[PDB]
Amino acid sequence: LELPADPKWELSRARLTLGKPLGEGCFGQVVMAEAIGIDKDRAAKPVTVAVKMLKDDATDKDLSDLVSEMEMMKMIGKHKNIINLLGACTQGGPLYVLVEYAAKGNLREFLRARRSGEEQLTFKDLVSCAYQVARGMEYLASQKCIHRDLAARNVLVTEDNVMKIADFGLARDVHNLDYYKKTLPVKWMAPEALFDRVYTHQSDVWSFGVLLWEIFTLGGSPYPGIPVEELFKLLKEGHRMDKPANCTHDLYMIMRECWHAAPSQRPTFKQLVEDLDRVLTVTS
Ligand SMILES: *CCC(=O)N1C[C@@H](n2nc(C#Cc3c(F)cc4c(ncn4C4CC4)c3F)c(C(N)=O)c2NC)C[C@@H]1COC
């Protein structure tokens, strides 16, 4: 693979050992791996990382897309609540892009597994998740970045229970079809993004509202049972999801504010961080 080497990011292949594919879906693209020297404090320690790689039969677009996503992560910079770029192997072999490893999977599965048992999460723990996703989104918005698909599936949880937004630098095709027919992204989409293909940081705020509903339903499916045809009618008429059973009134007003039809009437991510911060303080 003929590519330029960015020395400050280049990792030696001797330091990387590839492991098992992560997740059953899209297998082979993302694998678990160990990288020695990633932690500046412990040079000898192998650090578990996630490695994105191309398929054996990949197109030149697939390669350019992966390089562009890596390059956009370099521009955006690092934040605790986003999946960060750790390095890359671009010379003398196949392209490997290293990102932070999230042991506890995506937020939806993390919540569904912790609906019952000892690992069951408290109200404060669920508010902490919302605050961390809002913090990471505030940073991405400040760096001129629009996620376009903010949902629990695209938020990964570390072994230390840190929330990290994933695939933010990823370029997504606006529409698979008017009705995608894959037979779900439309439930998280704002009305302007869904009907007019308009994406702003305020459309991500609508998606954050749907994500907040996921958090307090512990990984619940938004608008359950409602077909896509009926969903378009319901949103145009002003109908919104009901308050999750284990959710406070003040938090449901934050959700209800994210779902204003007028984008500017929704709060900014700076304001959502501030609203979720006050919810964490009041509990004492
Ligand atoms: C196709 C794999 C997939 O959808 N999975 C597997 C599981 N999972 N994926 C991730 C990840 C990641 C990752 C990536 F590989 C590359 C990437 C990311 N941001 C940007 N970059 C591009 C290269 C520059 C990114 F988040 C993880 C992690 N990281 O722990 C896991 N853990 C499990 C689940 C997910 C969904 O499966 C249905």
Side-chain angles (χ1 to χ4, degrees):
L1 282 72
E2 61 107 282
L3 291 174
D6 192 350
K8 64 180 171 284
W9 290 104
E10 195 69 21
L11 179 84
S12 306
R13 298 183 182 277
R15 293 170 176 272
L16 188 73
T17 299
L18 304 165
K20 68 166 284 182
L22 291 177
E24 301 319 273
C26 53
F27 74 104
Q29 274 288 121
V30 178
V31 309
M32 200 198 301
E34 293 181 2
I36 298 173
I38 285 301
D39 185 0
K40 57 175 186 51
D41 302 320
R42 301 133 190 111
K45 182 193 178 297
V47 182
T48 306
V49 300
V51 166
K52 178 91 157 184
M53 59 167 81
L54 296 172
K55 318 142 295 184
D56 308 0
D57 55 357
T59 74
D60 296 8
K61 181 181 163 286
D62 289 333
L63 170 61
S64 72
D65 287 339
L66 179 52
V67 172
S68 295
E69 188 176 3
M70 169 176 76
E71 290 294 311
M72 196 59 74
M73 292 181 82
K74 292 178 183 179
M75 288 295 295
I76 289 159
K78 58 180 186 303
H79 186 257
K80 186 186 177 181
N81 304 118
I82 75 179
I83 286 288
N84 292 296
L85 176 69
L86 302 177
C89 304
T90 71
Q91 311 292 301
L95 173 64
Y96 300 133
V97 184
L98 281 71
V99 303
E100 289 172 320
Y101 170 69
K104 300 191 171 171
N106 73 51
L107 182 60
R108 200 192 81 174
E109 299 312 295
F110 170 85
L111 292 163
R112 288 186 175 181
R114 291 165 175 77
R115 282 175 166 182
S116 59
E118 299 187 358
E119 305 298 300
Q120 195 163 357
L121 303 163
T122 76
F123 171 80
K124 179 204 70 50
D125 292 344
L126 299 169
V127 183
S128 179
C129 299
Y131 180 75
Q132 293 178 62
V133 173
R135 285 281 301 283
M137 284 307 300
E138 181 188 26
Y139 177 77
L140 293 168
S142 73
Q143 300 302 298
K144 304 178 215 174
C145 172
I146 306 161
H147 199 289
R148 297 172 228 281
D149 187 16
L150 183 64
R153 56 169 172 278
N154 298 300
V155 176
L156 304 172
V157 184
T158 70
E159 183 62 31
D160 298 306
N161 299 299
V162 177
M163 303 294 126
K164 291 180 170 282
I165 296 152
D167 296 308
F168 43 87
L170 175 76
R172 304 169 169 78
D173 301 357
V174 288
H175 56 61
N176 294 181
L177 249 179
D178 63 306
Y179 170 49
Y180 288 55
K181 194 59 171 173
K182 43 85 173 51
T183 312
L184 183 62
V186 302
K187 294 186 171 180
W188 282 261
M189 287 168 84
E192 68 275 10
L194 177 56
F195 306 118
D196 305 294
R197 288 185 278 159
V198 168
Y199 292 88
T200 59
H201 301 301
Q202 297 308 108
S203 63
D204 279 350
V205 164
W206 177 288
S207 301
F208 181 75
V210 179
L211 183 150
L212 250 176
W213 190 96
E214 286 187 276
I215 288 169
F216 291 88
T217 52
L218 296 161
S221 297
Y223 313 97
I226 295 305
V228 298
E229 169 166 323
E230 187 186 345
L231 171 67
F232 304 153
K233 176 192 159 183
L234 294 170
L235 294 169
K236 294 248 193 79
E237 291 183 329
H239 296 288
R240 303 294 189 261
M241 289 188 284
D242 288 315
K243 173 179 80 77
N246 307 138
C247 180
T248 58
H249 171 79
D250 300 333
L251 263 157
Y252 182 64
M253 296 308 290
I254 290 166
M255 301 186 189
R256 216 79 203 278
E257 231 65 36
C258 297
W259 307 320
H260 279 301
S264 78
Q265 285 175 19
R266 301 163 194 168
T268 61
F269 282 111
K270 173 167 174 177
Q271 292 170 341
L272 287 166
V273 166
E274 292 172 355
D275 293 349
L276 282 310
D277 193 338
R278 297 191 311 275
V279 177
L280 287 167
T281 68
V282 168
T283 180
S284 56

mmCIF file of all heavy atoms in Angstrom, residues 245-275:
data_model
loop_
_atom_site.group_PDB
_atom_site.id
_atom_site.type_symbol
_atom_site.label_atom_id
_atom_site.label_comp_id
_atom_site.label_asym_id
_atom_site.label_seq_id
_atom_site.Cartn_x
_atom_site.Cartn_y
_atom_site.Cartn_z
ATOM 1 N N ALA A 245 -40.395 5.232 32.272
ATOM 2 C CA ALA A 245 -40.925 5.013 33.616
ATOM 3 C C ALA A 245 -39.973 5.483 34.728
ATOM 4 O O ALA A 245 -40.399 6.206 35.627
ATOM 5 C CB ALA A 245 -41.275 3.545 33.805
ATOM 6 N N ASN A 246 -38.688 5.116 34.646
ATOM 7 C CA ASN A 246 -37.710 5.513 35.654
ATOM 8 C C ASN A 246 -36.914 6.728 35.173
ATOM 9 O O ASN A 246 -35.697 6.657 35.000
ATOM 10 C CB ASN A 246 -36.782 4.342 35.982
ATOM 11 C CG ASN A 246 -37.492 3.064 36.375
ATOM 12 O OD1 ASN A 246 -37.104 1.971 35.952
ATOM 13 N ND2 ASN A 246 -38.544 3.142 37.186
ATOM 14 N N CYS A 247 -37.615 7.848 34.964
ATOM 15 C CA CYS A 247 -36.998 9.093 34.516
ATOM 16 C C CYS A 247 -37.658 10.270 35.231
ATOM 17 O O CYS A 247 -38.882 10.317 35.324
ATOM 18 C CB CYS A 247 -37.113 9.230 33.000
ATOM 19 S SG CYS A 247 -36.379 10.746 32.335
ATOM 20 N N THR A 248 -36.855 11.220 35.726
ATOM 21 C CA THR A 248 -37.385 12.384 36.434
ATOM 22 C C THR A 248 -38.023 13.373 35.462
ATOM 23 O O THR A 248 -37.722 13.353 34.270
ATOM 24 C CB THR A 248 -36.281 13.059 37.251
ATOM 25 O OG1 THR A 248 -35.218 13.431 36.378
ATOM 26 C CG2 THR A 248 -35.752 12.167 38.364
ATOM 27 N N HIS A 249 -38.909 14.236 35.970
ATOM 28 C CA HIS A 249 -39.572 15.236 35.136
ATOM 29 C C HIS A 249 -38.560 16.211 34.539
ATOM 30 O O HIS A 249 -38.656 16.535 33.358
ATOM 31 C CB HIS A 249 -40.638 15.998 35.942
ATOM 32 C CG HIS A 249 -41.219 17.172 35.214
ATOM 33 N ND1 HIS A 249 -42.184 17.011 34.237
ATOM 34 C CD2 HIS A 249 -40.942 18.489 35.343
ATOM 35 C CE1 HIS A 249 -42.463 18.231 33.802
ATOM 36 N NE2 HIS A 249 -41.740 19.151 34.439
ATOM 37 N N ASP A 250 -37.589 16.669 35.340
ATOM 38 C CA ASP A 250 -36.587 17.620 34.864
ATOM 39 C C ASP A 250 -35.768 17.040 33.709
ATOM 40 O O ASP A 250 -35.453 17.768 32.768
ATOM 41 C CB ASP A 250 -35.668 18.071 36.015
ATOM 42 C CG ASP A 250 -36.404 18.748 37.155
ATOM 43 O OD1 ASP A 250 -37.477 19.340 36.899
ATOM 44 O OD2 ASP A 250 -35.917 18.668 38.304
ATOM 45 N N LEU A 251 -35.458 15.734 33.751
ATOM 46 C CA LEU A 251 -34.708 15.091 32.671
ATOM 47 C C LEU A 251 -35.556 14.920 31.418
ATOM 48 O O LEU A 251 -35.038 15.067 30.314
ATOM 49 C CB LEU A 251 -34.156 13.730 33.118
ATOM 50 C CG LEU A 251 -32.699 13.716 33.600
ATOM 51 C CD1 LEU A 251 -32.435 12.539 34.489
ATOM 52 C CD2 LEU A 251 -31.735 13.699 32.425
ATOM 53 N N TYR A 252 -36.853 14.627 31.575
ATOM 54 C CA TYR A 252 -37.745 14.509 30.426
ATOM 55 C C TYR A 252 -37.959 15.865 29.749
ATOM 56 O O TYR A 252 -38.216 15.899 28.549
ATOM 57 C CB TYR A 252 -39.084 13.885 30.834
ATOM 58 C CG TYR A 252 -40.043 13.700 29.680
ATOM 59 C CD1 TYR A 252 -39.741 12.846 28.629
ATOM 60 C CD2 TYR A 252 -41.283 14.321 29.674
ATOM 61 C CE1 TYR A 252 -40.622 12.667 27.570
ATOM 62 C CE2 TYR A 252 -42.182 14.132 28.632
ATOM 63 C CZ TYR A 252 -41.856 13.285 27.591
ATOM 64 O OH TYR A 252 -42.745 13.104 26.559
ATOM 65 N N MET A 253 -37.820 16.978 30.488
ATOM 66 C CA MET A 253 -37.922 18.307 29.886
ATOM 67 C C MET A 253 -36.673 18.602 29.050
ATOM 68 O O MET A 253 -36.772 19.318 28.056
ATOM 69 C CB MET A 253 -38.139 19.389 30.957
ATOM 70 C CG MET A 253 -39.449 19.239 31.716
ATOM 71 S SD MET A 253 -40.940 19.096 30.685
ATOM 72 C CE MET A 253 -41.059 20.731 30.025
ATOM 73 N N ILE A 254 -35.512 18.040 29.430
ATOM 74 C CA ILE A 254 -34.290 18.146 28.636
ATOM 75 C C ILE A 254 -34.508 17.350 27.336
ATOM 76 O O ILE A 254 -34.201 17.855 26.259
ATOM 77 C CB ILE A 254 -33.055 17.643 29.435
ATOM 78 C CG1 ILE A 254 -32.715 18.617 30.589
ATOM 79 C CG2 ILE A 254 -31.852 17.467 28.506
ATOM 80 C CD1 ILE A 254 -31.743 18.076 31.651
ATOM 81 N N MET A 255 -35.110 16.145 27.417
ATOM 82 C CA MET A 255 -35.406 15.342 26.222
ATOM 83 C C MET A 255 -36.387 16.082 25.327
ATOM 84 O O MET A 255 -36.224 16.104 24.111
ATOM 85 C CB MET A 255 -36.065 14.003 26.584
ATOM 86 C CG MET A 255 -35.261 13.123 27.472
ATOM 87 S SD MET A 255 -36.101 11.537 27.637
ATOM 88 C CE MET A 255 -35.124 10.792 28.918
ATOM 89 N N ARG A 256 -37.446 16.627 25.931
ATOM 90 C CA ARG A 256 -38.498 17.333 25.212
ATOM 91 C C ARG A 256 -37.953 18.594 24.541
ATOM 92 O O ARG A 256 -38.453 18.988 23.489
ATOM 93 C CB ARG A 256 -39.638 17.702 26.182
ATOM 94 C CG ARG A 256 -41.029 17.628 25.571
ATOM 95 C CD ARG A 256 -41.533 16.197 25.496
ATOM 96 N NE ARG A 256 -42.568 16.046 24.477
ATOM 97 C CZ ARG A 256 -43.854 16.336 24.644
ATOM 98 N NH1 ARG A 256 -44.291 16.808 25.807
ATOM 99 N NH2 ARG A 256 -44.714 16.166 23.648
ATOM 100 N N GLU A 257 -36.928 19.216 25.137
ATOM 101 C CA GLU A 257 -36.292 20.401 24.572
ATOM 102 C C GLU A 257 -35.448 20.009 23.351
ATOM 103 O O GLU A 257 -35.439 20.741 22.365
ATOM 104 C CB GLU A 257 -35.419 21.101 25.636
ATOM 105 C CG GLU A 257 -35.685 22.590 25.787
ATOM 106 C CD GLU A 257 -37.073 22.931 26.293
ATOM 107 O OE1 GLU A 257 -37.606 22.174 27.137
ATOM 108 O OE2 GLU A 257 -37.639 23.947 25.829
ATOM 109 N N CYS A 258 -34.780 18.842 23.386
ATOM 110 C CA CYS A 258 -34.012 18.361 22.236
ATOM 111 C C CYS A 258 -34.917 18.081 21.032
ATOM 112 O O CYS A 258 -34.428 18.065 19.906
ATOM 113 C CB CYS A 258 -33.206 17.118 22.605
ATOM 114 S SG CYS A 258 -31.955 17.386 23.884
ATOM 115 N N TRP A 259 -36.213 17.807 21.263
ATOM 116 C CA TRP A 259 -37.126 17.467 20.182
ATOM 117 C C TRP A 259 -38.019 18.618 19.716
ATOM 118 O O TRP A 259 -39.105 18.360 19.205
ATOM 119 C CB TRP A 259 -37.983 16.254 20.565
ATOM 120 C CG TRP A 259 -37.199 15.063 21.024
ATOM 121 C CD1 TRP A 259 -36.025 14.607 20.500
ATOM 122 C CD2 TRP A 259 -37.657 14.043 21.922
ATOM 123 N NE1 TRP A 259 -35.665 13.428 21.107
ATOM 124 C CE2 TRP A 259 -36.659 13.049 21.971
ATOM 125 C CE3 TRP A 259 -38.800 13.889 22.715
ATOM 126 C CZ2 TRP A 259 -36.763 11.929 22.793
ATOM 127 C CZ3 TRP A 259 -38.899 12.779 23.531
ATOM 128 C CH2 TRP A 259 -37.891 11.814 23.562
ATOM 129 N N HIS A 260 -37.557 19.871 19.825
ATOM 130 C CA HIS A 260 -38.305 21.001 19.276
ATOM 131 C C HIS A 260 -38.189 20.923 17.758
ATOM 132 O O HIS A 260 -37.102 20.662 17.255
ATOM 133 C CB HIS A 260 -37.744 22.348 19.769
ATOM 134 C CG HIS A 260 -38.215 22.746 21.134
ATOM 135 N ND1 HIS A 260 -39.560 22.910 21.414
ATOM 136 C CD2 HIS A 260 -37.499 23.125 22.217
ATOM 137 C CE1 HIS A 260 -39.622 23.301 22.677
ATOM 138 N NE2 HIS A 260 -38.406 23.430 23.205
ATOM 139 N N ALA A 261 -39.287 21.135 17.018
ATOM 140 C CA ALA A 261 -39.231 21.089 15.556
ATOM 141 C C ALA A 261 -38.264 22.148 15.018
ATOM 142 O O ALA A 261 -37.510 21.875 14.085
ATOM 143 C CB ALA A 261 -40.616 21.298 14.972
ATOM 144 N N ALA A 262 -38.255 23.334 15.640
ATOM 145 C CA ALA A 262 -37.354 24.421 15.266
ATOM 146 C C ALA A 262 -35.951 24.136 15.812
ATOM 147 O O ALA A 262 -35.771 24.128 17.027
ATOM 148 C CB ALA A 262 -37.873 25.731 15.832
ATOM 149 N N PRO A 263 -34.942 23.890 14.955
ATOM 150 C CA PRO A 263 -33.606 23.553 15.480
ATOM 151 C C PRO A 263 -33.018 24.518 16.509
ATOM 152 O O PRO A 263 -32.440 24.062 17.492
ATOM 153 C CB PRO A 263 -32.738 23.486 14.223
ATOM 154 C CG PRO A 263 -33.674 23.166 13.130
ATOM 155 C CD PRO A 263 -34.979 23.805 13.484
ATOM 156 N N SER A 264 -33.138 25.836 16.292
ATOM 157 C CA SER A 264 -32.571 26.818 17.219
ATOM 158 C C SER A 264 -33.234 26.759 18.601
ATOM 159 O O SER A 264 -32.582 27.072 19.596
ATOM 160 C CB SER A 264 -32.675 28.229 16.650
ATOM 161 O OG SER A 264 -33.979 28.770 16.788
ATOM 162 N N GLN A 265 -34.515 26.358 18.670
ATOM 163 C CA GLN A 265 -35.210 26.222 19.950
ATOM 164 C C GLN A 265 -34.671 25.050 20.784
ATOM 165 O O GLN A 265 -34.917 25.001 21.988
ATOM 166 C CB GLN A 265 -36.729 26.089 19.738
ATOM 167 C CG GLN A 265 -37.393 27.407 19.360
ATOM 168 C CD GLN A 265 -38.857 27.265 19.024
ATOM 169 O OE1 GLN A 265 -39.515 26.276 19.373
ATOM 170 N NE2 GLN A 265 -39.414 28.269 18.362
ATOM 171 N N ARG A 266 -33.928 24.121 20.167
ATOM 172 C CA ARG A 266 -33.299 23.023 20.898
ATOM 173 C C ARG A 266 -32.070 23.592 21.612
ATOM 174 O O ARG A 266 -31.484 24.559 21.123
ATOM 175 C CB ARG A 266 -32.843 21.914 19.931
ATOM 176 C CG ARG A 266 -33.951 21.300 19.091
ATOM 177 C CD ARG A 266 -33.383 20.538 17.908
ATOM 178 N NE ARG A 266 -34.416 20.227 16.925
ATOM 179 C CZ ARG A 266 -34.184 19.779 15.696
ATOM 180 N NH1 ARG A 266 -32.939 19.590 15.274
ATOM 181 N NH2 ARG A 266 -35.192 19.528 14.874
ATOM 182 N N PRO A 267 -31.614 22.999 22.729
ATOM 183 C CA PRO A 267 -30.415 23.535 23.388
ATOM 184 C C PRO A 267 -29.133 23.151 22.656
ATOM 185 O O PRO A 267 -29.116 22.160 21.933
ATOM 186 C CB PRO A 267 -30.473 22.912 24.782
ATOM 187 C CG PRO A 267 -31.199 21.641 24.597
ATOM 188 C CD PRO A 267 -32.155 21.835 23.454
ATOM 189 N N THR A 268 -28.061 23.925 22.845
ATOM 190 C CA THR A 268 -26.764 23.585 22.263
ATOM 191 C C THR A 268 -26.136 22.492 23.134
ATOM 192 O O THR A 268 -26.586 22.287 24.264
ATOM 193 C CB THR A 268 -25.854 24.823 22.204
ATOM 194 O OG1 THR A 268 -25.629 25.306 23.529
ATOM 195 C CG2 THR A 268 -26.421 25.931 21.332
ATOM 196 N N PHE A 269 -25.100 21.797 22.638
ATOM 197 C CA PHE A 269 -24.435 20.782 23.458
ATOM 198 C C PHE A 269 -23.766 21.412 24.681
ATOM 199 O O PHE A 269 -23.751 20.791 25.741
ATOM 200 C CB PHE A 269 -23.449 19.929 22.640
ATOM 201 C CG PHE A 269 -24.124 18.861 21.809
ATOM 202 C CD1 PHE A 269 -24.142 18.940 20.428
ATOM 203 C CD2 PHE A 269 -24.742 17.778 22.413
ATOM 204 C CE1 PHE A 269 -24.772 17.962 19.670
ATOM 205 C CE2 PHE A 269 -25.387 16.814 21.653
ATOM 206 C CZ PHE A 269 -25.385 16.904 20.287
ATOM 207 N N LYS A 270 -23.316 22.673 24.582
ATOM 208 C CA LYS A 270 -22.772 23.402 25.729
ATOM 209 C C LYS A 270 -23.846 23.531 26.814
ATOM 210 O O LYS A 270 -23.566 23.310 27.991
ATOM 211 C CB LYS A 270 -22.284 24.792 25.288
ATOM 212 C CG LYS A 270 -21.847 25.695 26.435
ATOM 213 C CD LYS A 270 -21.089 26.910 25.937
ATOM 214 C CE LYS A 270 -20.794 27.872 27.059
ATOM 215 N NZ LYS A 270 -19.985 29.034 26.604
ATOM 216 N N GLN A 271 -25.083 23.834 26.404
ATOM 217 C CA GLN A 271 -26.220 23.959 27.311
ATOM 218 C C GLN A 271 -26.650 22.599 27.863
ATOM 219 O O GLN A 271 -27.064 22.530 29.014
ATOM 220 C CB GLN A 271 -27.396 24.644 26.597
ATOM 221 C CG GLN A 271 -27.117 26.108 26.276
ATOM 222 C CD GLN A 271 -28.146 26.741 25.369
ATOM 223 O OE1 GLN A 271 -28.905 26.066 24.669
ATOM 224 N NE2 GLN A 271 -28.249 28.059 25.411
ATOM 225 N N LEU A 272 -26.551 21.519 27.067
ATOM 226 C CA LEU A 272 -26.907 20.182 27.548
ATOM 227 C C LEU A 272 -25.918 19.709 28.605
ATOM 228 O O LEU A 272 -26.331 19.138 29.610
ATOM 229 C CB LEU A 272 -26.963 19.163 26.400
ATOM 230 C CG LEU A 272 -28.159 19.260 25.451
ATOM 231 C CD1 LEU A 272 -27.920 18.436 24.203
ATOM 232 C CD2 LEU A 272 -29.443 18.804 26.125
ATOM 233 N N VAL A 273 -24.617 19.977 28.412
ATOM 234 C CA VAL A 273 -23.584 19.654 29.408
ATOM 235 C C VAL A 273 -23.912 20.366 30.723
ATOM 236 O O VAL A 273 -23.817 19.779 31.798
ATOM 237 C CB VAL A 273 -22.177 20.064 28.899
ATOM 238 C CG1 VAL A 273 -21.149 20.066 30.025
ATOM 239 C CG2 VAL A 273 -21.720 19.161 27.764
ATOM 240 N N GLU A 274 -24.344 21.619 30.612
ATOM 241 C CA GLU A 274 -24.698 22.460 31.747
ATOM 242 C C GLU A 274 -25.956 21.948 32.451
ATOM 243 O O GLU A 274 -25.985 21.899 33.678
ATOM 244 C CB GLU A 274 -24.883 23.906 31.267
ATOM 245 C CG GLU A 274 -23.577 24.535 30.806
ATOM 246 C CD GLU A 274 -23.698 25.895 30.146
ATOM 247 O OE1 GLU A 274 -24.841 26.365 29.944
ATOM 248 O OE2 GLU A 274 -22.643 26.486 29.819
ATOM 249 N N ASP A 275 -26.978 21.542 31.687
ATOM 250 C CA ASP A 275 -28.216 21.010 32.252
ATOM 251 C C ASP A 275 -27.958 19.683 32.970
ATOM 252 O O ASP A 275 -28.407 19.513 34.102
ATOM 253 C CB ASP A 275 -29.281 20.819 31.155
ATOM 254 C CG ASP A 275 -29.790 22.105 30.534
ATOM 255 O OD1 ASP A 275 -29.481 23.188 31.073
ATOM 256 O OD2 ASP A 275 -30.501 22.027 29.508
#
